[PDB]
């Protein structure tokens, strides 16, 4: 299958370059199909951004960012870029790289240039002027106790989204609620994760929520203990 | 300036039929364009659906159950993206595009299809005190958690020693989860002093008619 993933920064500042870069695996770069990079404002809706083709690295781009927009290619790398200048809050989003069907399924169709078959996961980035913040992490301890109790950790006042919670390294999965975040009026975020666990399991099991805030380069383990 | 046209939400009963239009602007035609159709569920990216020119030119898609295709409105100058026997896993937004040789690719607007059959579910609520770690950092957050409800609508309010608190209130938007029901937060932020100085804090959750309110107490 034909991976695709973004990756970069998850926060530029304004009037700076956001600079993204879409690793393929398991497929060639070259080949009569665009690569294309489209995104998403948060709850927005979707907005093309450009293309270079497979085969002729030629590049055609959005006519209202013509001027602030590069994509180019690395071939020894297999991986193209997106470079996006002089940003603004208006350019806050999830970016997605994507890849058009083969030569084959288009028979006369024109290109397939606005056909997207295969996606990247996306990565958000935040354009704004406030410095990134980690997390601190405190326990949600559960609590009479009912026959299911809820544990938890809240991840509170950090800068950029995301996050991402696991627990105990991702062997416990059933009954794991990570919510939205939240964001203050001082502009921090905050967001908690709850896995609710049968009563008998507080006297056996050991609970660590796993915290990952990437754009400060900060984890947290956190043992959510029960007092 | 040619534009895509979508209404931004559409709502139908589960096993109905339903047409999903993208109506271009009157200086483009219809009938020149393939009009492409991309799915998003929450929490994931767009997934190619199908594109429809004409019944000579059209592709279904690896995965796309047959109830759904593509369709035109030449009259209405508009794509159609038609639906049949509707499942409530069809809960998606739904987005048009064509190709235009000045204006490059134009999205519309999106249409958030919605199913009208779900029950009513009521709210499950977990309040959280402040951690003692917290406490000592002359801090305390009160963190009410929502889940499991359906309407997303839901109203928080906060009370300390039963009487309305009016202020230190944030209440995210409700999500949806992987159940189809949805999902919210609302945290009260205090300090230590304020925490020690009531007996008693309260989450308020109304949804629809009624509401379920959880009580921690300091020490």
Redesign the interface.
């Known amino acids: 299958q034909v991976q695709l993933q973004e990756s970069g920064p998850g926060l530029v500042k304004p009037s700076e370059t956001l600079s993204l870069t879409c690793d393929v695996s398991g497929g060639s770069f070259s080949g009569d199909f665009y690569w294309?990079w489209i995104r998403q404002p948060p709850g927005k809706?979707?907005?093309?951004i450009?293309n270079i083709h497979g085969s002729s690295a030629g590049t055609?781009?959005?006519?209202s960012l013509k001027s602030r927009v590069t994509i180019s290619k690395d071939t020894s790398k297999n991986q193209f870029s997106l470079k996006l200048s002089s940003v603004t809050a208006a350019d806050t989003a999830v970016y997605?790289c994507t890849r058009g069907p083969l030569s084959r399924?288009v028979a006369?169709?024109?290109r397939g240039?606005?056909?997207?078959?295969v996606?990247?996961?996306?990565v958000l980035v935040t354009v704004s002027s406030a410095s990134t913040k980690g997390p601190?992490v405190?326990?949600?301890?559960p609590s009479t106790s009912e026959s299911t109790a809820?544990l938890?950790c809240?991840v509170?006042d950090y800068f950029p989204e995301p996050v991402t919670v696991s627990w105990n390294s991702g062997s416990l999965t059933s009954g794991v609620?990570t919510?939205?975040?939240?964001?203050?009026?001082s502009g921090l975020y905050?967001?908690?994760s709850?896995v609710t666990v049968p009563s008998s399991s507080l006297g056996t099991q050991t609970y660590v929520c796993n915290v990952n805030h990437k754009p400060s380069n900060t984890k947290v383990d956190k043992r959510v203990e029960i007092? | 300036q040619p534009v895509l046209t979508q209404p931004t939400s559409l709502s139908a009963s589960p096993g109905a039929s339903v047409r999903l239009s993208c109506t271009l602007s009157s200086g483009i035609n219809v009938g020149s364009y393939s009009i492409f159709w991309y799915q998003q569920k929450p929490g994931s990216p767009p997934r190619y659906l199908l594109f429809y020119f004409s019944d000579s030119s059209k592709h279904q898609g690896s995965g796309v159950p047959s109830r759904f295709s593509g369709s035109k409105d030449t009259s209405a100058n508009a794509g159609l993206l038609l639906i049949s026997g509707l499942q409530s896993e069809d809960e998606a937004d739904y987005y048009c595009a064509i190709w235009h040789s000045s204006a490059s690719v134009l999205f519309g607007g999106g249409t958030r299809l919605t199913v009208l059959g779900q029950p009513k579910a009521a709210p499950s609520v977990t309040l959280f005190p402040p951690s003692s770690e917290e406490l000592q950092a002359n801090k305390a957050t009160l963190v009410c958690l929502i889940s499991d409800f359906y309407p997303g609508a839901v109203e928080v309010a906060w009370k300390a020693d039963g009487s309305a608190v009016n202020a230190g209130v944030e209440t995210t938007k409700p999500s949806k989860q992987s159940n189809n029901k949805y999902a919210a937060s609302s945290y009260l932020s205090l300090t230590s002093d304020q925490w020690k100085s009531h007996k008693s804090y309260s989450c308020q959750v109304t949804h629809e008619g009624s509401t379920v309110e959880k009580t921690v107490a300091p020490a």
């Open positions: 294309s809706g979707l907005d093309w450009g055609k781009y959005k006519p997605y399924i006369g169709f024109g240039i606005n056909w997207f078959d996606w990247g996961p996306g601190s405190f326990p949600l301890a809820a938890g809240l509170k609620h919510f939205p975040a939240v964001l203050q009026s905050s967001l908690s709850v007092k």
